[PDB]
């Protein structure tokens, strides 16, 4: 309706690849959208500017949003802790879907994941809060730099994050 | 299998 | 001397001990640690108390507080940092991680994200694929014969 | 001992010898091997290499295009899922009184790939003119190096048992002529393959190239619009797989007529119901293409059923079955210590740097 | 014999586990704290108390109910209101969501209101919703307007939780007081000479606006008839897709009343020269649902406004309020707001826990004796 | 006063089978043996009521006196006094806002949020505490749970 | 495919009201469906025969299957314990859906519910294993005996239950 | 609210 949109300018080793627009669902999930939008502007000191995409699996997703450790074990929410699973209204339609990663039930942090395939097995287990609005060609490009392991050959990073409307 | 966790990555 | 810290390092942590001490006894309890923000949402809090206990009484006194955080300095080594990491998987300190001890420590971290039958299956196999001698438990010789290559020790560092 | 969940089976320490598996005839006892492989039991490193090589030598002497005669039970992808293979043999029939035709992909994806090789190869020795095995796209090194079969072989046995499998996989036949009516491949067609004489005169015993007739046999897929061809053209590029081609309905409905074939039986693709019958060839009223998937609840995530396809007495029977329980393994077969230490290293440091927050 | 002693600082706490959450006040507000010297209610002082789950004295609670019941009495069946109005749908006892609609819709000190009914039942803070709205109606007699929903009767309030709510929080005297005050609630509302606002809908026995005026209110809603249908009638599932034309059909969903179609609505709007009919009664996902627009104007012939978000704590619906000014109909939308928990039917944790406690203990002992 | 040896003999045989180290005193492990006692919320609570001496372990004199409150030939006042003790953790004859919560989180678990469980624990006390002390007595407990027939279901055969 | 069909012969205070037959989706939920079937047959020595529907909430559902306590607190399965939540393939699409009742995650016994309307919020939380084949009229007739809290005015019992075909 | 549990009935 009056839903906040944010961006991600992807960088392979250092050189630009393009931006990805993200429509957040403040209408369906209020708290969870603000937890992404707050770290996308970087208005709390710590943000998505200068962040790594640790796990990237082809035909699955792009896990990122870990800055306190960059290996997958870290990250912290804007609520000064780790928040609760808001609700499981939105499902994993297919490609483009942006959902919250967790360490189990009610353990939501700063870590998220962008889907490249239909991931219905994660419904009711992960909180969906956004979809790619524009720049799906850029996501399909990030995809081919991964493996079965999740390991990134050429270190994929985010270096420019902000907000649109 | 195919999961997205933060710390203990499962099957 | 086998200790680590010097003058201004022990003096700075002495200012941090009186603030943590609610009752000012001189000994930090578990119910004194779990009052802090980023500690009630951490699975291994009770572990960094039972291992930080050179005597074993539930309370982490100032002698054990300086000696424990000493392995977390830039002046710590390899054979030392993985020794503390070995003592995580060992709750009773007998120097041998038994079959069901490994289960208990992992459930502390994993919980119900793995089913009961699942965790035991991978434990029974981790032991069969690493216990070279065949004692039914893992020592610090066998634990190092596995993890001593991924090098997690270069990150187990805090500041004075 | 300290063993908490006691009711769960403990994998037997004992690795089976040459006497326990084999006989004095040289015929392996499949039922003695089955029950052991089901308890997660391994074999003596040399007898594992003997089941492979003896069975590889039997596949070498077999030709490029096998001539299978009815009644047969056609299977698709088994994909490591061993505990789902035991169930397949129950819905389809015992290997003694039943003829089998597997379309490929026994390895990768599922964390029990080596067991699927050892049982099928043990069955290949005991029943060479009954049990038939073909070649799927995962029976190559590049897809086992990238996926989980290499890491399986290193961990369960040795990298030499892997090189035994890799040498055996090249001895695996590409296609099968089932009852002079069916062409059986893993993926499908090739534009470089017009007739059946184009499959017979091919250099197998090599690693599948990124292109070519051998690649297209194991890698090809039908168009997602197989039937509704607003955009014609026989062979287009396969965007989903990366390499190889796509085959439309008039590409199949001309290969059939040109070689007097009824239908093509393939696998390769994941099917929800366990199979899929495509547009009928309006010459016979029979589906021009049928895909068969034998891996149920593929990757323990898609809740797909698996089907087997038995052709007996001019009737094609498609029998569906569900997932059977299996033992857990962490990704890349890693041990708990390698999996849990990175979490300990931070959940102790995020505890100690947060104890220095008060002052 | 004084001598100041030394106390233990670790023993200076209370047992209460979740210290952060507020404990509802033990203080009951008096007439001196609720009412002014001119007899004006202090709504801002009331809001602040009720939001913390604080009760009033049983006596002053009755004063707010009877005083507002007396103002609703002197009002007509069909009210005469005009723009700028902010029309609201069902609230269903969701107090903390009624608090949010007053932000999105504006303060009652400068904004005109029209509630289409359903203040009670389903939500567990119904007595807080009556006590606040009635208080507003005492302070703004010609600004704030309240209608009658199908739940504003003793049939539905005795089946659902409202009677129990009053009995647990106040008493049955406040329930009876609320029941007479509910009888005094107006049925319809003519807004800006263009609109007709009711709870349910039309009636086969209501043809003109003169019918509603001559109708006898001040009673418990009947099982059959006009007053019942104003409060219970739902529009026929397919509105504009009606194959076999009929006017009113038996409402199979409700179990009483009738269903109304488009040739039944566009018929009423011409004999009365009205623009549209705004109703509530049916739960909407978007908080509203604009029905088939009459091609003679282009404006929806029906609207269905629903002001209760995340209905029954589980529907996950948005709620919508309805602002109207300068010939434009503004549909504002809002989500849920936190509200305290209550056990089903206002029961205490002992009546809720003992059946499970009785069992889990018996099965610990019958599975310790029967293992040999 | 005692009971009758027919039932006490049976209890004793079952007690000896439960005694792993044959000490008499049953620990946390000596109870969490049985598959129908490990995944049950109120094991720890029933252990602490049986333990009439506070040593943390149950013996024979206590194993008899505990299942005595549950025997077929019991009474209402006797059965509800046990029900009261499930919530009264520190045995002072008074249930607190913390004791009442702890016991309920043992039962409801994660099916209710902490704030939500606390709110209904606060509200039970407001409506049930007549003397105003912030805590609940046996008299204040029975004034609540006296009307219901809970005593008819707390029966076991020996 | 070869999915079993069970029958329930309903009885209001001894007097028959009607018969409700269910299709048990054993194809999608084999362990959960076998449970209901075997309890309807009573082959294991215990089951649904004689048990009551203790909680009927009109416009919502009809809960029953507590053959050990008849009040909601009891009930046991054929697997000894209380089995795990098999899967959540099937959703509470609408009226007629037969589903399991729990005491949170992985606590499935014998107790179940028959939806009289669509209950989407139970998706991912409760296991669906069946639907009403013939006899939705009887379930609607059962509704007329309920209340809001579920307590029945007259005692509705499963006078006879078994398997069809 | 509208839940189906076995022992502790919630809102
Ligand atoms: Ca202290
Ligand atoms: Ca100490
Ligand atoms: Ca040990
Ligand atoms: Ca060892
Ligand atoms: Ca003992
Ligand atoms: Ca004792
Ligand atoms: Ca107490
Ligand atoms: Ca008291
Ligand atoms: Fe495959
Ligand atoms: Fe309503
Ligand atoms: Zn394939
Ligand atoms: Zn209504």
Domain ranges of chain C: 1-160
Residues E267, E248: Cα–Cα separation, whole Å: 12
Report CA-CA distances (Å) from E221 to E151, E227, F138, G163. 10, 7, 46, 48
A107 in reach of chain D (CB within 8 A): no
- Tell me which residue of G58, E312, E336, G112 sits closest to H2, measured CA to CA: E312
Distance from CA of F32 to the nearest CA of H (A): 23
Q: How was this structure determined?
A: X-ray
Using the mean position of ligand 6's atoms as its centre, give its distance from the Cα of residue F63 in Å.
9
Q: Which residues of G are catalytic?
A: 55, 60, 63, 102, 113, 122, 126
Tell me phi and psi for residue D60, to 5 degrees: -70, -45
The string over H1-11, giving b where at least 16 C-beta atoms fall within 10 Å of a residue's C-beta and e elsewhere, is ebbbbbbbbbb
Tallying the residues shown for chain H, one arrives at: 11
Residues E307, F66: Cα–Cα separation, whole Å: 55
Evaluate whether chains E and D are touching (3 or more beta carbon pairs less than 8 Å apart).
Answer: no
Q: Hey, what long-range contacts does F4-8 have (CB within 8 A, 24 or more apart)?
A: F7/F71, F7/F158, F8/F64
**A83 catalytic per annotation:** no
A149 in reach of chain D (CB within 8 A): yes
The residue from D14, D36, D138, D234 that is catalytic is D138
Residues F125, F140: Cα–Cα separation, whole Å: 10
Residues C51, C85: Cα–Cα separation, whole Å: 10
F126 and E24: CB-CB below 8 Å? yes
Considering CB atoms only, which of D148, D301, D346 is closest to A74?
Answer: D346
Residues F132, E264: Cα–Cα separation, whole Å: 61
List, in order of start, the domains of chain D with CATH numbers. 1-359 (3.60.21.10)
Determine what percent of chain D falls in helix, strand and coil, rounding each to the nearest 5: 30, 20, 50
**A63 catalytic per annotation:** yes
Tell me phi and psi for residue D199, to 5 degrees: -95, -35
Dihedral angle at the C-alpha atoms of D130, D136, D141, D147, nearest 10 degrees? -120
Return the half-sphere exposure (C-beta side, CA atoms, 13 A cut-off) of residue E92.
20
Contact E281, E229 (CB under 8 A): no
Domain assignments of chain A as residue spans, ordered by start: 1-165
Chain C partners within 8 Å of A80 (Cβ) = 37
At CB < 8 Å, which residues of chain C contact E? Answer: 22-24
**3-class state of residue A93 by DSSP:** coil
Residues D287, D281: Cα–Cα separation, whole Å: 6
Question: The tokens 């012939």 sit on which residue?
Answer: E301
F113 → chain A, closest CA residue? A84
Contact D340, C97 (CB under 8 A): no
Chain F partners within 8 Å of A104 (Cβ) = none
Return binding residues of D for Fe cation.
77, 79, 105
Return the half-sphere exposure (C-beta side, CA atoms, 13 A cut-off) of residue F121.
28
- Tell me which residue of D269, D238, D263, D245 sits closest to D77, measured CA to CA: D269
Contact residues, C window 104-143, toward B, CB-based 8 Å cutoff: 109-110, 113-114
Return the half-sphere exposure (C-beta side, CA atoms, 13 A cut-off) of residue D302.
18
CA angle E12, E14, E16 (to 5 degrees): 150
Tell me phi and psi for residue D52, to 5 degrees: -70, -60
Residues D89, G8: Cα–Cα separation, whole Å: 37
Q: Which helix (H) or strand (E) holds D88?
A: helix D85-92
- Tell me which residue of F97, F85, F109 sits closest to F135, measured CA to CA: F97
What is the structure's resolution, reported in angstroms to one decimal? Answer: 2.8
- At E180, list the tokens: 């007479």
CATH number, domain A1-165, options 2.60.40.420, 2.40.100.10, 3.40.50.300, 3.40.640.10: 2.40.100.10
Contact D41, D11 (CB under 8 A): yes
Rg (CA), chain C: 18
Q: How deeply is B10 buried, as exposed, middle or buried, from its count of CB atoms within 10 A (0-12, 13-18, 19+)?
A: middle
Report CA-CA distances (Å) from A160 to A11, A16, A130, G161. 9, 10, 19, 66
Contact D239, D295 (CB under 8 A): no
Residues E235, C145: Cα–Cα separation, whole Å: 75
G162 in reach of chain E (CB within 8 A): no
Residues D14, D188: Cα–Cα separation, whole Å: 43
The residue from A108, A111, A122, A145 that is catalytic is A122
CA angle C132, C137, C143 (to 5 degrees): 65
Using the mean position of ligand 2's atoms as its centre, give its distance from the Cα of residue C52 in Å.
8
**3-class state of residue A108 by DSSP:** strand
- Considering the domain F1-158, what is its CATH architecture? Orthogonal Bundle (1.10)
Return the half-sphere exposure (C-beta side, CA atoms, 13 A cut-off) of residue E295.
1
Query: Is the peptide bond between E84 and the residue preceding it cis, with omega within 30 degrees of 0?
Result: yes
- Tell me which residue of E55, E14, E12, E284 sits closest to E166, measured CA to CA: E55
Tallying the residues shown for chain C, one arrives at: 160
Report CA-CA distances (Å) from D226 to D219, D253, D306, G63. 17, 11, 22, 47
Q: How deeply is F155 buried, as exposed, middle or buried, from its count of CB atoms within 10 A (0-12, 13-18, 19+)?
A: middle
D255 contacts: CB under 8 Å, gap ≥ 6: D183, D189, D194, D261, D264
Proximal ligand: closest to the CA of C32: 1
Order of strands, sheet of E248-250, starting from the edge strand that comes earlier in the sequence = E234-235, E258-260, E248-250
Report CA-CA distances (Å) from E113 to A34, E70, E116, E149. 32, 19, 10, 16
How many helices (H) and strands (E) in chain B? 0, 0
Contact E278, E299 (CB under 8 A): no
Q: Where are the beta strands (DSSP E) in chain D?
A: 65-68, 72-77, 100-104, 131-133, 175-178, 182-184, 221-222, 235-237, 245-247, 263-266, 275-277, 280-281, 286-287, 289-292, 306-312, 315-321
- Domain C1-160 annotated CATH 1.10.238.10: yes
SS (H, E, C) chain E: CCCCCCCCCCCCCCCCCCCCCCCCCCCCECHHHHECCCCCECHHHHHHHHCCCCCECHHHHHHHHHHHHHHHHCCCCEEEECCCEEEECCCCCCHHHHHHHHHHCCCCCCCEEEECCCCCCCCCCHHHHHHHHHHHHHHCCCCEEECCCCCCCCCHHHHCCHHHHHHHHCCHHHHHHHHHHHHCCCCEEEECCCEEECCCCCCCCCCCHHHHHCCCCCCCCCCCCHHHHHHHCEECCCCCCCCCCCCEEECCCCCCCEEECHHHHHHHHHHCCCCEEECCCCCCCCCCCCCCECCCCCCECECCCCCCCCHHHCCCCCEEEEEEECCEEEEEEECCCCCCCCCHHHCCHHHHHHHHHHHHHHHHHHHHHCCC
B9 in reach of chain C (CB within 8 A): no
Rg (CA), chain F: 17
Report CA-CA distances (Å) from G76 to A150, G39, G63, G110, G158. 43, 10, 15, 5, 17
């Amino acid at each position: 309706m009056v839903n906040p949109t944010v961006f991600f300018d992807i960088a392979v080793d250092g050189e630009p690849l393009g931006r990805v627009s993200f429509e957040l669902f403040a209408d369906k999930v209020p708290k969870t959208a603000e937890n992404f939008r707050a770290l996308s502007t970087g208005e709390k000191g710590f943000g998505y500017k200068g962040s790594c995409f640790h796990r990237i699996i082809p035909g699955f997703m792009c896990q990122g949003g870990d800055f306190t450790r960059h290996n997958g074990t870290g990250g912290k929410s804007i609520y000064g802790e780790k928040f609760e699973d808001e609700n499981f209204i939105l499902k994993h339609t297919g490609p483009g879907i942006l959902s919250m990663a967790n360490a189990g039930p009610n353990t939501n942090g700063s870590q998220f994941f962008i889907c490249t395939a239909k991931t219905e097995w994660l419904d009711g287990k992960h909180v969906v809060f956004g979809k790619v609005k524009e720049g799906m060609n850029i996501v399909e490009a990030m995809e081919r730099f991964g493996s079965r392991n999740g390991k990134t050959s050429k270190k994929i990073t985010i270096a420019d994050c902000g907000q649109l409307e | 299998x195919l999961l997205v966790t933060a710390g203990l990555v499962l099957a | 001397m086998c200790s680590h810290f010097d003058a201004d390092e022990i003096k700075r942590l002495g200012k941090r001990f009186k603030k943590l001490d609610l009752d000012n006894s001189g000994s930090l309890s578990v119910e004194e640690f779990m009052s802090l923000p980023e500690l009630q949402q951490n699975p291994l809090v009770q572990r960094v108390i039972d291992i930080f206990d050179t005597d074993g009484n539930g309370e982490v006194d100032f002698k054990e507080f300086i000696e424990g955080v000493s392995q977390f300095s830039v002046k710590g080594d390899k054979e030392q940092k993985l020794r503390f990491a070995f003592r995580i998987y060992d709750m009773d300190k007998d120097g041998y991680i038994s079959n069901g001890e490994l289960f208990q420590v992992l459930k502390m971290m994993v919980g119900n994200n793995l089913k009961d039958t699942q965790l035991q299956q991978i434990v029974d196999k981790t032991i069969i694929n690493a216990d070279k001698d065949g004692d039914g438990r893992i020592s610090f010789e066998e634990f190092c014969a596995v993890v001593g290559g991924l090098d997690i020790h270069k990150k187990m560092v805090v500041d004075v | 001992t300290d063993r908490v969940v006691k009711a769960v089976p403990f994998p037997p320490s004992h690795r089976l010898t040459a006497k326990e598996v084999f006989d004095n005839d040289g015929k392996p006892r499949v039922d003695i091997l089955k029950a052991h492989l089901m308890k997660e039991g391994r074999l003596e490193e040399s007898v594992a290499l003997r089941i492979i090589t003896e069975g590889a030598s039997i596949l070498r002497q077999e030709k490029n295009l096998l001539d299978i005669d009815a009644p047969v039970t056609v299977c698709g992808d088994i994909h490591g899922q061993f505990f789902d293979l035991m169930k397949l043999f129950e819905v389809g029939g015992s290997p003694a009184n039943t003829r089998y035709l597997f379309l490929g992909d026994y390895v990768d994806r599922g964390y029990f790939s080596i067991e699927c090789v050892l049982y099928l190869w043990a069955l290949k020795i005991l029943y060479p003119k009954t049990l038939f095995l073909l070649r799927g796209n995962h029976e190559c090194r590049h897809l086992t190096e990238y996926f989980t079969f290499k890491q399986e072989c290193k961990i369960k046995y040795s990298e030499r048992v892997y090189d035994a499998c890799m040498d055996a996989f090249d001895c695996l036949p590409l296609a099968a002529l089932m009852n002079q009516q069916f062409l059986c491949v893993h993926g499908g067609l090739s534009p470089e393959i017009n007739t059946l004489d184009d499959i017979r005169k091919l250099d197998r015993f090599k690693e599948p190239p990124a292109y070519g007739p051998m690649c297209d046999i194991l890698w090809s897929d039908p168009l997602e619009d197989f039937g509704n061809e607003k955009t014609q053209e026989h062979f287009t590029h396969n965007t989903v797989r990366g390499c190889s081609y796509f085959y439309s309905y008039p590409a199949v409905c001309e290969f059939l007529q040109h070689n007097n074939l009824l239908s093509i039986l393939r696998a390769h693709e994941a099917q929800d119901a366990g199979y899929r019958m495509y547009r009928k060839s309006q010459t016979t009223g029979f589906p021009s293409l049928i895909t068969i998937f034998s891996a149920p609840n593929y990757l323990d995530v898609y809740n797909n059923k698996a089907a087997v396809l038995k052709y007996e007495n001019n009737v094609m029977n498609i029998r569906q079955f569900n997932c059977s329980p299996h033992p857990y393994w962490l990704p890349n077969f890693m041990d708990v210590f390698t999996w849990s230490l990175p979490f300990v290293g931070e959940k102790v440091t995020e505890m100690l740097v947060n104890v220095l927050n008060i002052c």
